[PDB]
Amino acid sequence: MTLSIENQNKLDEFWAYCVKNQYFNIGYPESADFDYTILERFMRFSINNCGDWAEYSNYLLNSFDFEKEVMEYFADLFKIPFEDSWGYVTNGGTESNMFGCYLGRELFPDGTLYYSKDTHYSVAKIVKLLRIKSQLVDSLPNGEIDYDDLISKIKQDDEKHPIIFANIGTTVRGAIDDISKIQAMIGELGIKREDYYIHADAALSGMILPFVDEPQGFNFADGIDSIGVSGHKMIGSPIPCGIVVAKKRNVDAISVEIDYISAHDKTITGSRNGHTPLMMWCAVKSHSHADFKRRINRSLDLAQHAVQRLQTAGINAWCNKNSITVVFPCPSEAVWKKHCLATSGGQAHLITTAHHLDASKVDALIDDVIKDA
Amino acid sequence: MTLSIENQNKLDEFWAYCVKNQYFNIGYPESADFDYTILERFMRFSINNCGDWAEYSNYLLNSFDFEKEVMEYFADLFKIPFEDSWGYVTNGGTESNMFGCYLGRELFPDGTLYYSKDTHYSVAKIVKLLRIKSQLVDSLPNGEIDYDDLISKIKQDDEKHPIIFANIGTTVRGAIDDISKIQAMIGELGIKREDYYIHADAALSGMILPFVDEPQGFNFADGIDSIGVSGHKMIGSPIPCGIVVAKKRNVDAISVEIDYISAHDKTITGSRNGHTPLMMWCAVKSHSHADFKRRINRSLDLAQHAVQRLQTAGINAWCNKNSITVVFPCPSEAVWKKHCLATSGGQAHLITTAHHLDASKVDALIDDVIKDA
């Protein structure tokens, strides 16, 4: 017995619904312009990247060789020498952000973890999971952490080892927590850079800032301890994956040697997706530095186009520097529902992802918006 | 620019290596006989099951409707009413075992978590992650928990809320921790069933025990709180996935309401694989109860064939009841390396997965083994 008829129908129905809604996305960050056609055929094989890609697995079907080259592409792109970097292709930004917060928690067991109000809900999950001590920090109106309130709270807490959760591209407002500012302000409290942690959540903007003229602080040159990127968000992927990149010195230090049983690798998962590493390898090798930059200039311009056409009209819309998230006041139940806009407190937004080769879908928006004014 | 030539070569090299090694597996539990050809085409779409499948997502490209039907297949297969069950399709057994241990930790914050020496290394990761209090328990020689040492340690600890990690199909020896025995022994210590947790790790055997004549205690009738299964292990999947099934009453109780930020769903991840739920839906709908049973009788018989042919010769090999893991003393550096046998302390093993339509690959083993004797 193969699939019934009602079941075969459901599947084929679903395919049509996906064809229908393939390029639906205007409000979320998941870019839908990829071609991994050439990889469809590898779904034939039981591929398993269980374990560290740097070590070896008797489980022969694994993309470790391709995972290695993705980790060397990101090492270099985030300006850490690959020899000095450790990380892997995760199941999403969340696993990437959990790994980083895990890294900080192990280095600074007593450390309070600090995170703004404009931080991804995923950090709530992480904080419960890792039973880690947490202090919420206020947000500036553009979505940035209230840096001043961070330091105020770091002092009241009398915290010697703060774990800084830095939002590098806020979900709602596209904000970027200036890690260079933070470092200076925590330097000014007389805390050494060695005695505290900074994790970059860069789900979206980790594949923006590297192809921008004047990037904010985010990378390893800029002095972070670990970064998380979402493969599926900006590069585009059919399967959610993540890249996490940390300092080997830190990763190595936190020895996973338990009551008799020895976790043989520094990964959070057991058996890992081996298909997504191929998917990430293709995207990263099928686009030059210049090809991504093009894609992001077009995304950035379009987001300017949208502020413009809206600013000309009554509407006080804006876009943070290097953001592709245009924030404006939230309109009718029609508009947000009929474009799938993420709406969160008197504010909607669109993201000018690069599956828009054209503003057609975006002007389609602004027209249904100016019609309220 | 599309893929270079050296890069296109690497990918095509790799495909040939996978064709070569497609059915290599004799020592690990990952079954390589699946046809998800019909699903290859859905790699075109950016599918994202971010969130709970029972609720709704404005992110339109999701397999929630297919995830729902997989969760109702397992609810029923593990003998809990679907209305009374919660769970999801995870990224592996590990995420399934982390969710369960998370569930226990939240219900019994002070609870020591108990686990045998023959427990998967993944539990070491989990225990560090969830900063949960842990007590190692001895193993009987067949791989089962030293039940007597469990209870001894539950008493010394003066533990009122033990979190029992039950190995339902040990990785090395194929053992099954008898959850009915455990329940009775902890009943006999005068501990109420409501005041402690039992998680089944069933990575492999969760798709064995349901199609066996006399199954051990494992399911919700048998009185567990949560089970984890690995999709890729027994059913077979190109991408590692998991199923975790828990009690709604328990899941719901542990409210994820943090300092201002509200994790909107009871999942551990953010954005989740939407392709693997299809993959699991196909496997579960393309096989009758009788089709799986056939597959597992053949696996069980073959594992008997292997004990037999080895027992006839000098070799003291064995197989626990309902196991498809034939344990024998570990031979030369040749044999284990040249069959990719997982070797762990004077013992090797083969798993008679059902990508062996025939003992040919298995007799190939026993021949290179009897040749030492």
TrEMBL record, chains A, B:
The modification N6-(pyridoxal phosphate)lysine is found at residue 233. It catalyses: L-histidine + H(+) = histamine + CO2. Its EC number is 4.1.1.22. Substrate binds at residue 120. Its cofactor is pyridoxal 5'-phosphate. It is an enzyme of class 4 (lyase). Pfam families: Pyridoxal_deC. Keywords: Decarboxylase, Lyase, Pyridoxal phosphate. One of its GO terms (biological process) is carboxylic acid metabolic process. One of its GO terms (molecular function) is histidine decarboxylase activity. Homotetramer. HAMAP family: Pyridoxal_decarbox. Belongs to the group II decarboxylase family. This is Histidine decarboxylase. The gene is hdc.
